[PDB]
Amino acid sequence: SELLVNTKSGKVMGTRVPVLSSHISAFLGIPFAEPPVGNMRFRRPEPKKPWSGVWNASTYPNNCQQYVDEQFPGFSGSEMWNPNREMSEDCLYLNIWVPSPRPKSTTVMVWIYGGGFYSGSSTLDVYNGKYLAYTEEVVLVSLSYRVGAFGFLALHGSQEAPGNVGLLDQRMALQWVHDNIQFFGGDPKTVTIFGESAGGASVGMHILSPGSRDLFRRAILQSGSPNCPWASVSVAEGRRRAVELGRNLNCNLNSDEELIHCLREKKPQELIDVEWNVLPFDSIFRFSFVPVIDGEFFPTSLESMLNSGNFKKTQILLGVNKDEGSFFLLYGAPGFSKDSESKISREDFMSGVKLSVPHANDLGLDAVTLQYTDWMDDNNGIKNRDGLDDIVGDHNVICPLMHFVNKYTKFGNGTYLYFFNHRASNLVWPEWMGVIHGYEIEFVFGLPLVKELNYTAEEEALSRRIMHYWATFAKTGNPNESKWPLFTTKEQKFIDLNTEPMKVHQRLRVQMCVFWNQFLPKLLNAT
Amino acid sequence: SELLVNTKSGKVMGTRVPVLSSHISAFLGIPFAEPPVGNMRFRRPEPKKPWSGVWNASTYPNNCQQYVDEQFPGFSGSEMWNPNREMSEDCLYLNIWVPSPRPKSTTVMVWIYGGGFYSGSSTLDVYNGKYLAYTEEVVLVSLSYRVGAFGFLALHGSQEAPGNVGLLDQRMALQWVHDNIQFFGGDPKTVTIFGESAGGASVGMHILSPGSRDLFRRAILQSGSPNCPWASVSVAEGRRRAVELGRNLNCNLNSDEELIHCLREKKPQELIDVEWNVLPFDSIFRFSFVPVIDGEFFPTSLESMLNSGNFKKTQILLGVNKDEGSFFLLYGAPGFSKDSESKISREDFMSGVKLSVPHANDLGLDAVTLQYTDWMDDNNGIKNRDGLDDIVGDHNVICPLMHFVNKYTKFGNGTYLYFFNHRASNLVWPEWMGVIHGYEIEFVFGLPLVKELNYTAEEEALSRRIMHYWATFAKTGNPNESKWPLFTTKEQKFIDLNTEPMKVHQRLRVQMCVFWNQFLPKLLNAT
Numbered sequence A, B: 001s002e003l004l005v006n007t008k009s010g011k012v013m014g015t016r017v018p019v020l021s022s023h024i025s026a027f028l029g030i031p032f033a034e035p036p037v038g039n040m041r042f043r044r045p046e047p048k049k050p051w052s053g054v055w056n057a058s059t060y061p062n063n064c065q066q067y068v069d070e071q072f073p074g075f076s077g078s079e080m081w082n083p084n085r086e087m088s089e090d091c092l093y094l095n096i097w098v099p100s101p102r103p104k105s106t107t108v109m110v111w112i113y114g115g116g117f118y119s120g121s122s123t124l125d126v127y128n129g130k131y132l133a134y135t136e137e138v139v140l141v142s143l144s145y146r147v148g149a150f151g152f153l154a155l156h157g158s159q160e161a162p163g164n165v166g167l168l169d170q171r172m173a174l175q176w177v178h179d180n181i182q183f184f185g186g187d188p189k190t191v192t193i194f195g196e197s198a199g200g201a202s203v204g205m206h207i208l209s210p211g212s213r214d215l216f217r218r219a220i221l222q223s224g225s226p227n228c229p230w231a232s233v234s235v236a237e238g239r240r241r242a243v244e245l246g247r248n249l250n251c252n253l254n255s256d257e258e259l260i261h262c263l264r265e266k267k268p269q270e271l272i273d274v275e276w277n278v279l280p281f282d283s284i285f286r287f288s289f290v291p292v293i294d295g296e297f298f299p300t301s302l303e304s305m306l307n308s309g310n311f312k313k314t315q316i317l318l319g320v321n322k323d324e325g326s327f328f329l330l331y332g333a334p335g336f337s338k339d340s341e342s343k344i345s346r347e348d349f350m351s352g353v354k355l356s357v358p359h360a361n362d363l364g365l366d367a368v369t370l371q372y373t374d375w376m377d378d379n380n381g382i383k384n385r386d387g388l389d390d391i392v393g394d395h396n397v398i399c400p401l402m403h404f405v406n407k408y409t410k411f412g413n414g415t416y417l418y419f420f421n422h423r424a425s426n427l428v429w430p431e432w433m434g435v436i437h438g439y440e441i442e443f444v445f446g447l448p449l450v451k452e453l454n455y456t457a458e459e460e461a462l463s464r465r466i467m468h469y470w471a472t473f474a475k476t477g478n479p480n481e482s483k484w485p486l487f488t489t490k491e492q493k494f495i496d497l498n499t500e501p502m503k504v505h506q507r508l509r510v511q512m513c514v515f516w517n518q519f520l521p522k523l524l525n526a527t
């Protein structure tokens, strides 16, 4: 009946969820792989054997085991993104929000959430799919994927904990969407995978892996590229980090199989607890367990792939927002504090840049400084603050994205790039942080439609323009039905996406992105 | 009588020269050393044995042998600075312009002319001392010094052609000024040596050499520092260049004494002719025979001296003008032409920067480009033009000067720094060149007082403000009798010197001078 569909796995009973002045049918919690518990820890996802009877998809699923942030307890700003259902190793499920009436076959959008590859959840409130589904008539599915040690440990030649198992969890959720979205009214021939931060970086990874390209149509990447420094380690480094974690649990490190066993016997939180004492340096915006470029999955280095066009060739929509840096600076660079108007000193500035470009040599730090300091007022505390805010942002999201944009527009079927720079009116974070990495999401998912949560009317509107551009891109292959230009390697146009009449501009962070994407590398290459 | 003074060398008969509505006494051509002809070529200056009878100092002296510029014949812009009396190896003389009435004892200013150490003359019309002497009542002496191969050849251990003989010619003219200016009304206890380009760079050299410090009071350096890349070679390089020149004359290069002999037998123009085929690279703003840092004269590297305060400690007045680069670019960088509005291409730009930073490695050129290009419009022909104009200027005069300013203000008795940026109204050079290296001189020497040569009234005035600041500094030790701040290593003030109400500003070319004076060196040091 409307809330009871039959899929190749079995029947599933969903629910009606109100949305604005109406309803939608929601199927929360459909399983798609087997609970990777115990022995299966660190193994690739197995597909979920089909069921009898009707499965009750009316409750969001457990969240995955992950790091919970207690830096600013109760503060909604932090809590927003913390997991909200009990964490469980068993956590591989989907959530689908369909219209009522169930459409015949409509556009589908799959949201891969981000969170540095160490956290994240489907069930967050800011990832509530009902508003988008409802307003644009699309089906929306959110997926879960294993994050962290559990999702990205990577003892290379050991089939017991090869890398990227969490990446495959994404791919398996994509396949089930393919094979069964049809019974939900969706059109498998037009599914768009979207995602922010590590989700937007996972999205591009699937555009590059041979095996995933076929499972989706087009993609939308938000503040992420597969090539962002923090999203990938070499094989070696992944080994390196798993003996190091091996040591923080006092595991047997002889027989590699024993490493795997030892960890497979520790309880989840132990691993969560020592999860960060394994990184190799003092660094801000750098995470411990991430995708390894293993050869399988990613045939070869992403630079080669990018360089040769070896990747899916659809059109994409991607963008960056004004203050990417802030969050990391706040939570990790000395001098910054929520509550202060964090004017940095030149002392803490030079401390700051080291945390930001952790791999740079001294000469390299010199180059960075020279680029980001205002010599004409070399200690203006606030300028020092904002300058680090750009050093982290540029180096960690804007520049790697403009790289991917630039390489992929030579072989893809169209690129739409946005620059978001609106500060929501009801943000709880301090003004200095600006347009934080993460705050565009709430607009994309329609929370400014809910009156109860106090946004301003122009934000309601900005949220509608966005959701439209998004859904309209998700089918048409293009975002406008004024015209948002295509990005092109000549006069590289993009638009600002805010509450004022969109304006096309050209060459995003060009001067700085030359430094980061070309200069620095060549300098660190020499010496 | 007024035109016939008696000096420790003998008597000298000068002349009355009109100046404005009056006269002055002029003593042109007094000898101060022995004509360094033939056998004495390349030897140190001998002092001039005294004479009997009265010497007739009423005619300017011969000019020194040197390179004459025929790039734009007849064009006054070029011709201005070309030698105007027959060139002669015999060319060591002074010119003194005294008031009428002869003062008892007044301030003295000695003008050491510049010209890249390969050219220059006392007798130029733009170096006519009468207007300054007249208006400010100072005695003004101009000196000649041997330039070029003849002045700076440098077969290190050979007393027959040790280096810097031309530098010593300056010093000997300083001594005679010391010992005899008194009979001309000047006060030996208050002589200021001033000079532009290589003169302003020679001036600072004397502030550093042990032996010259005592011969003058204070100094004024215009577009020059002793430490400008082009003003000094190592001992080695000076050797290197003299065998190379040895070869262009097909000299015997075995016995070093034979090298010296061979050259001592070639006629002057042969040496002038091959004078440039000895430099070691393709470069703009770099000259062949220059001061060697030989240990004697300059005890040690100038960086040490600067670094330790080992130098005379008076107050100085120095400055730079807006478009230093232009002249060299015009005469030596591809794309530029008098007559064109020289918009450069990115092709000729990258050719340009190589000529400008001839010692840089590729990475280094990369660094320069990154700093001087507008990535947001990376091929705007005019921006490429002006950007090279700053690369040459900064690297060759502004930055080395701000270095010397900064080091010397920690131990000197006061520093007054100006930035000249007025375009004379009657300049003959094309507008693109702007405030050319060299054009402030005409203001300092009072040519805007002469109506016949068409300047505008505000320029007349600017010329008077200047001549005053200059003479007033030459006695007082300070330029103003509104107040032009002292330069200080904190809020490094300077003023613009132009036809509008002078404004103090701070930190001249600070962002760029960090790159050149600190960044680059460290990068070229690593690799």
Ligand SMILES: C[N+](C)(C)CCCCCCCCCC[N+](C)(C)C
Pocket: A081, A114, A115, A116, A197, A276, A327, A328, A331, A332, A437, A438, A439
């Ligand atoms: C990306 N979204 C917007 C979805 C969530 C980001 C939440 C704050 C991000 C910075 C904190 C990094 C913390 C790492 N530790 C706690 C280990 C310092």
Ligand SMILES: C[N+](C)(C)CCCCCCCCCC[N+](C)(C)C
Pocket: B081, B114, B115, B116, B197, B276, B327, B328, B331, B332, B437, B438, B439
């Ligand atoms: C400095 N002052 C203003 C006094 C005279 C400079 C005259 C033009 C300077 C640039 C030409 C360099 C030429 C070198 N060669 C001819 C060898 C290319």
